[PDB]
Amino acid sequence: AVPNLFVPLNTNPKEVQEMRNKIREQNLQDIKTAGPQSQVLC
Amino acid sequence: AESRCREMDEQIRLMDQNLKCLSAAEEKYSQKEDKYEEEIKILTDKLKEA
Amino acid sequence: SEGQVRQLEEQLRIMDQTLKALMAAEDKYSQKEDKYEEEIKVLSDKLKEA
Amino acid sequence: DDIAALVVDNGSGMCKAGFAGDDAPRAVFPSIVGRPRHQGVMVGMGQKDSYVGDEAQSKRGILTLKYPIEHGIVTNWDDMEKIWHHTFYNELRVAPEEHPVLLTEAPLNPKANREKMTQIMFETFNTPAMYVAIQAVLSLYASGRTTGIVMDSGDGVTHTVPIYEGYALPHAILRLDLAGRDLTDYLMKILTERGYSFTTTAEREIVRDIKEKLCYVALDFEQEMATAASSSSLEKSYELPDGQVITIGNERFRCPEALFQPSFLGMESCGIHETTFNSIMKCDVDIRKDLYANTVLSGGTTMYPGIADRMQKEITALAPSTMKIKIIAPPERKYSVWIGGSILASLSTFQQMWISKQEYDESGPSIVHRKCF
Amino acid sequence: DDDIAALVVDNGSGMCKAGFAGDDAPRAVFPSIVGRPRHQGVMVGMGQKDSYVGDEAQSKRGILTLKYPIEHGIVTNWDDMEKIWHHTFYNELRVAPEEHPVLLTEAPLNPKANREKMTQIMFETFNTPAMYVAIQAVLSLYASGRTTGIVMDSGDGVTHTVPIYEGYALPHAILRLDLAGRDLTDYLMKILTERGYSFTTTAEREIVRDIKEKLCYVALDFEQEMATAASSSSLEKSYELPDGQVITIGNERFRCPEALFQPSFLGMESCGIHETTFNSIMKCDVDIRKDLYANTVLSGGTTMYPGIADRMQKEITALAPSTMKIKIIAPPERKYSVWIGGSILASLSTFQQMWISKQEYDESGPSIVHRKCF
Amino acid sequence: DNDNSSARLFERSRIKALADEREVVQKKTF
Amino acid sequence: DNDNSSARLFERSRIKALADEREVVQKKTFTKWVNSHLARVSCRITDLYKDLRDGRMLIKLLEVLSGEMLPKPTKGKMRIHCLENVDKALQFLKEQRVHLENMGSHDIVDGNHRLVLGLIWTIILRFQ
Ligand SMILES: Nc1ncnc2c1ncn2[C@@H]1O[C@H](COP(=O)(O)OP(=O)(O)O)[C@@H](O)[C@H]1O
Ligand SMILES: Nc1ncnc2c1ncn2[C@@H]1O[C@H](COP(=O)(O)OP(=O)(O)O)[C@@H](O)[C@H]1O
Q1: Residue E288 backbone phi and psi in degrees, to 5
Q2: Which of C14, C20, C27 to mutate against chain F (most F CBs within 10 Å)?
Q3: What is known about its subunit structure (chain A) (predicted)?
Q4: What homologous superfamily is domain E181-260 in, according to CATH?
Q5: Is residue D201 within 8 angstroms of chain E, CB to CB?
Q6: Are E136 and E154 in contact, with CB atoms under 8 Å apart?
Q7: Nearest to residue D296, comparing CAs of D169, D178, D163, D105?
């Protein structure tokens, strides 16, 4: 239990590789976005 | 407004130089990759030769 | 003075967009080029062994 | 999907904050707290006990600037609470009860720092979930590779950690107390030789601006001494806020050289290149050639022009000659940690790893050592 | 010894001292002030003096504008400094500088051009055969009689602490603070306005300085002393001006030197002398701080006030860990300790090889001193 | 300076644009 | 604790007693030899550790043994003058290629017993 206590096992690296590309897509495309608006504001 | 305009002109023409300064090396390897692959083809032939 | 300030800075933003696009393409083909660069090495090792 | 988490990077120098899944942080501001020191005479102007962050930078003439974080350790917790309140309410304008937060801190730190950070983020802000991560692991997320040794140099502390195939070797982590604040103090010391004297905490920011603008890392130290002694081509001119003009000259490449030779500060420790090489040699034999090819620079202190060539040349000199050394320095390496935080904060498989509020209630603040790292 | 005895010249901000090496006391001590007349000249037939230098300028203060060539340890004006040196060599010591090597003192942290100009002036004009530059706190440690301790020297222009352990100095722990006797003089001159006495011109600065030298002391407890002085008039002194009026100094006796310990009275945010000494000690290594606690040496005239040693010891003991002993060593003749250390330095046979020769100056130029001195 | 110029470009465009857009939306809604 | 207590008792008994007893006899024999050579110049030493602090006795002993003039000691009673005299003696030993390890002027001046005994033994063995 002591070698890999901190992380869950059997996870695909392709998911992380996809997400980094998805984040870089916004930088390339220069997207306008706003932050999440609160429910109490709504 | 005029003093801001001076600075803005400085910035735009500095970046105007910078852009095609970056363009040149990109199209340098665009012509480089041709020999870099055509030599690999001859190298593969010399590989199967042995 | 307001007029040319407003024109110049959006011209600048267009031109920095172009700079970003060309820089991204450069990063593409460089990260391709290094793996191709050691592809040729593996090919040469195969040749020498044979 | 549901509500997005918050990513907050608290380095020793400057604080950064934004929403998870974003490319760049929304709020970037210095981590200072200022209080007035002179008499106040104008009746009716209103009172203000403290100035937090950027607001303290503009009115720094009549304040005594104080840093809450010193050498990566939170010394004054009240000013940290003030900084966090300012970040949450004035910079991002979000209620902290709706969002989980992810925080960053140094590899080797006292246990009480993490315990008090967890207690503060649960007890006062009432966040539903929180997590703590090492900054350099987030740098390796930002780079996007599974294997490499990463060296992060901030304003408080420098640390090197190697990671191979997702496994981090704990005994090879090296920590060095040589950072940007020490270089700023050394620049204040060596600017005395030309006649300029800066003493109060207001002028420390002026010295920091001078260091960020007109300093560079020499490729060869003695040759640059010979060149600067022969000619006056290396001098540059800077303008003070009050209108006086100073001219540095020789001291441009002597301040950042002190990272590579810490004996200028009186420190006995080795340079950053030797620290990285020693941290590589502490690992096993089979992973060393992978660590030579994936050295990553992170943190703002590595934004001197010419740091990469000097580091590559030094490590090439120290390493055996049969292998290749490449140093991977992204241009946006200042915010790399925060970018890594975003990549971590909105993974699908990461959502099971938040420290739940119920778990904190039933375990005390000691739950952060069992989880996190 | 078959060689000509060297001259030791100590050049502080306030007073210049000069004497022969191997002597226990200097020959010439005089204020370093240059005066110029300001009034209309009548009675043709009497003498023409362009400038008044030194002690004579203190005798005719009424008709002169008094200037200090050295302020904050930096030689701002060089012609006045040359006049001071000429009056020292020819009118005070009556010796030719071409026959004697000379020894010079200066503050630890100061511009490099000061050293270069000092060497260039004293070789090219006075034609001295050899010279050397020393740091005043090191000479204070020489004259203390020990080779290990921390020196806090405060002149009329600068304050500095250096630690030295067994002959080795630590350059990263040297601390410099720009709070000295001139700022205390200006603060006393400002706070004398409360009682109604006004001193504005440069001639009254010496009167205020004499008042500070004769009627000031450092209180052990500041708030209790303030309450005592506000309760009654048991702490009051009377000082008479040169024209006849008598002023009552009263409460200001322990408020002028208190700015030494609390610089916030002067508008400066730096720490006091006790915190500066403590911070300099903690900048050193772990093993040697115990020896530095037991060997604290006070130097300079600014530390000549009554009760400065007890107050300094009381302040440091609270800041320091309680488990060991704090000893403040204050020699009674600390005002001339720098010159005494300079005299001992020029008496050693090993020191005779460290002089900057005229041949070396002709070879390297005025840049030799940074290589040769310290 | 080219790395400095690229960092300046990133900080000027990407960091500032999101903050300005969020400020606009928050101001209109408030 | 009991094992450590008995162990350090063994140290402070046997190690300390043997070293201290040896150095006492060794000091007595050394000072007799030094008084034997120093009768020619009519100087003598009562204590080995105390009398060598000033360094004039060492200079005179080297004058006796070498038979040649050394630099004159500086007529100073300060601490630094004592260091100067001891440094002069050690330097005079240094030109004639007599090997010394861990030898310093302050070691002789502050009165280190082993270092003074080692210097005297080196002078005995390598010079005469
Ligand atoms: N462009 C730059 N060039 C050189 N040094 C810099 C630059 N920007 C920041 N620094 C140094 O880095 C420090 C800020 O680093 P930072 O990344 O904020 O550290 P952290 O975020 O860990 O507190 C500053 O004090 C300064 O000394
Ligand atoms: N007896 C005294 N009591 C109190 N202060 C004194 C006394 N004598 C001198 N001072 C102060 O010390 C200053 C002289 O210091 P000094 O040692 O001459 O400095 P330097 O030699 O570096 O110029 C004077 O300006 C005076 O204010």
Answers
A1: -100, 0
A2: C20
A3: Heterodimer of an alpha and a beta subunit or an alpha and a gamma subunit.
A4: ATPase, substrate binding domain, subdomain 4 (3.90.640.10)
A5: yes
A6: no
A7: D163
